[PDB]
């Protein structure tokens, strides 16, 4: 029944999240961030709005989606860099 629309989008936040994920993903062995991951943030936000049966995606859905994708990226990193990367990415996710 439910098909959530994106609206009021924090375009700059998702853009900065993807840009930073791409930059820090230049580490040769890391999880290979690609445009399909950018679209994945939007799919995940839509799924969270789906869980609420909400035909619009709120900021809470998008923020939870960003938290999932960033944590999934950070969790895949080796311990030598994971603290520094988690601290760097915290501005996007621990604001929620």
């Amino acid at each position: 029944k439910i098909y959530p629309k994106l609206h009021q989008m924090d375009m700059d936040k998702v853009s900065r999240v993807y840009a930073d994920l791409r930059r820090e993903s230049i580490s040769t062995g890391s999880f290979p961030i690609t445009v399909r991951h950018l679209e994945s943030i939007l799919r995940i936000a839509e799924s969270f709005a789906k869980m609420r049966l909400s035909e619009f995606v709120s900021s809470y859905d998008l923020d939870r989606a960003i938290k999932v994708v960033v944590d999934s990226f950070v969790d895949a990193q080796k311990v030598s860099v994971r603290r520094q990367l988690r601290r760097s990415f915290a501005i996007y996710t621990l604001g929620h």
């Binding site: 998702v14 993807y18 840009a19 950018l38």
Partner: protein
């Protein structure tokens, strides 16, 4: 026409590895493609920001209106009209090359063949991405297709320039991809912020001899050197 899409061996292109190790395909099948594009994630942050804004405009549904405005503005055409137009071009026109176009194409062929020869010498192996007389016919077909858009019954100099440019942008770019003593000699003898005119470095290194241009390519990729002033001045710009 065959339009084919593929990933390299190791999935991601693995830039520091040899192209002959990254590319699965034999030179036989590769030669049958008029244009081979090697596509890479540039990872440039400005580009990634731009792509992110664009993709968001797709998923938000803004792009549905944007394409319609672009079509009505005459800056774009639809699937249907373009389909009919390709059919019309394929049935009305089949242009020849003018003599001038023919000469430019011929000299371009010998030029790219020379580039491939020297690259195979510099890498001491036969190139995986080939340049062959079949690939001259690739540039011929591309020239003709470019004239075939506008239904011009002959291709001209302008169409050959664009055909050459596209082949350079695709198949050549696919093909395009002791010095340790000479580079530290240059670092020792040219300190920071000063210029060595190139020909004097060539004379000095020869007087000790092709290692020179490898050293310059490496040091130019790094920040340490900058080829100023039409390439005449080797400038120790960086560290």
């Amino acid at each position: 026409s065959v339009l084919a899409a593929a990933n390299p061996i190791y999935g991601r292109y693995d830039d520091l590895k040899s192209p002959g190790d990254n590319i699965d395909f034999q030179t036989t099948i590769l030669s049958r493609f008029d244009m081979i594009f090697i596509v890479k994630d540039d990872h440039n942050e400005e580009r990634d920001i731009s792509i992110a804004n664009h993709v968001i405009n797709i998923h938000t549904g803004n792009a549905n209106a944007m394409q319609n405005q672009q079509e009505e503005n005459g800056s774009e055409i639809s699937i249907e009209k373009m389909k009919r137009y390709i059919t019309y071009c394929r049935l009305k026109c089949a242009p020849r090359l003018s003599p001038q176009a023919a000469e430019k194409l011929s000299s371009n062929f010998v030029t790219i063949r020379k580039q491939l020869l020297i690259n195979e010498l510099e890498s001491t192996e036969r190139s995986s991405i080939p340049i062959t007389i079949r690939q001259l016919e690739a540039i011929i077909r591309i020239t003709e297709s470019l004239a075939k858009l506008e239904l011009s019954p002959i291709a001209q100099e302008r169409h050959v320039d664009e055909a050459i440019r596209l082949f350079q942008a695709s198949t050549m770019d696919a093909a395009s991809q002791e010095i340790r003593r000479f580079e530290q000699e240059l670092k020792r003898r040219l300190p920071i912020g000063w210029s060595t005119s190139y020909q004097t470095l060539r004379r000095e290194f020869v007087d000790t001899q092709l290692a020179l241009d490898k050293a310059l390519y490496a040091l130019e990729k790094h920040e340490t050197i900058q080829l100023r002033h039409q390439g005449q001045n080797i400038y120790r710009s960086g560290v």
